[PDB]
C-alpha cells in the first residue's frame, strides 16, 4: 500500500545497513572498531576524542532509527575512521596498524554501499529524509 511505502523503504534500508555492519564487525581486520574504545584502558581517549563511535554503537543507532540514508550511516563509519586517525599517533608499529586498518574500514564500507545499494533506492531514501 502506498501509505506504507516510507516505512517499507526504511525497513529495507535498516536491514541492509545491519547486514553491512555485521559484515564489518565480524571481519578480523576491524575487530578493534567493533566495540567502544575502553576508556579505562586508554585513559586519555576521551580527552582527545569528542565523539566516540564504533560498530556496536552503529548497530544500536540503526535500531534507534538514527539513519534514514546510507549517507547518514557512512557519516558514522567515517567518524570511526576519523577518530582512529585523530587519536592514534604515528609512532610505533601497533599505531600504524590501527591507523591503516581504520582507513581500510572506511574504504571497505564505502565500497559495499556503492556496490550493493541501487542509486534509485537511495533517491527514495533521500526523498523520505527530505520530507521530515
Amino acid at each position: 500500500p502506498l501509505e506504507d511505502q516510507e516505512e517499507n523503504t526504511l525497513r529495507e534500508l535498516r536491514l541492509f545497513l545491519r547486514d553491512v555492519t555485521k559484515r564489518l564487525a565480524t571481519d578480523k581486520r576491524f575487530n578493534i572498531f567493533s566495540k567502544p574504545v575502553d576508556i579505562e584502558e586508554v585513559s586519555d581517549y576521551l580527552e582527545v576524542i569528542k565523539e566516540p563511535m564504533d560498530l556496536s554503537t552503529v548497530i544500536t543507532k540503526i535500531d534507534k532509527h538514527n539513519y534514514l540514508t546510507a549517507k547518514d550511516f557512512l557519516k558514522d563509519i567515517d567518524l570511526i575512521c576519523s577518530n582512529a586517525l585523530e587519536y592514534n599517533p604515528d609512532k610505533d608499529p601497533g599505531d600504524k596498524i590501527i591507523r591503516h586498518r581504520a582507513c581500510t574500514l572506511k574504504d571497505t564500507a564505502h565500497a559495499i554501499i556503492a556496490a550493493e545499494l541501487d542509486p534509485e533506492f537511495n533517491k527514495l531514501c533521500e526523498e523520505i529524509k527530505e520530507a521530515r
Binding site: 584502558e41 586508554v42 586519555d44 581517549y45 580527552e47 582527545v48 576524542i49 585523530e86 587519536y87 592514534n88 599517533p89 609512532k91 610505533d92 601497533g94 599505531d95 590501527i98
Partner: peptide, 6 residues
C-alpha cells in the same frame, strides 16, 4: 593525538 594503545 593521544599516547596510543601500545
Amino acid at each position: 593525538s593521544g599516547r596510543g594503545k601500545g
